[PDB]
Design a protein around this nucleic acid. Sequence first.
DNA 1: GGGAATATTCCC
DNA 2: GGGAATATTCCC
Lengths: 93, 93
Amino acid sequence: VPAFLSKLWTLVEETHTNEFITWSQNGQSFLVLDEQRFAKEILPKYFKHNNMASFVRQLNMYGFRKVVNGPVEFQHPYFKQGQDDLLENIKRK
Amino acid sequence: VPAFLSKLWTLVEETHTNEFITWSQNGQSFLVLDEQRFAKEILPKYFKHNNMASFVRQLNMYGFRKVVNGPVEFQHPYFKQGQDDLLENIKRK
DNA sequence: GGGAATATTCCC
DNA sequence: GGGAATATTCCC
Ligand code: NA
Ligand code: NA
């Protein structure tokens, strides 16, 4: 499991970040709320940048898809709450 | 000129970093003094890491060579004090 | 030092 | 969103 996936799981799961990034209700996707504050305040604590576009570039590199200020939602079939055993099934493109 | 070369020039030229990274006497190379403190304190102000090996990986990627705690010295034929016009001649391998 | 994997940036 | 350039990491 590459660092991006382990950090992303920690990021979503961690309670102290849930103001900005957290599981959806059904646990089959995650939400990013307050994207401007998320990228300035949260991203540089886990990654080497503060750019939402670079975070989303990584999501796309691992096959995450968007779920169609305001919350944004992303999903991967093998990124599921309580099922971190599926993380090894996610492949970098 | 890629970001590494412009930052490296700024890093060497800047007086406030000369405790750790500075031109040699003849201006044809630069010196890194106190490498442990250089990488913990100076590198993360200009790059996205604090690892001497990653800085040296970039030097090698641009054709810099080492000049044979203790000071270490690096040179490139087109990295010359007062001649930043030569920076465009440095090529990434 | 350098090849190659992953990360970030840049641009279409 | 994704190709490709540059940056950083990892390993030999
Ligand atoms: Na969270
Ligand atoms: Na300096």
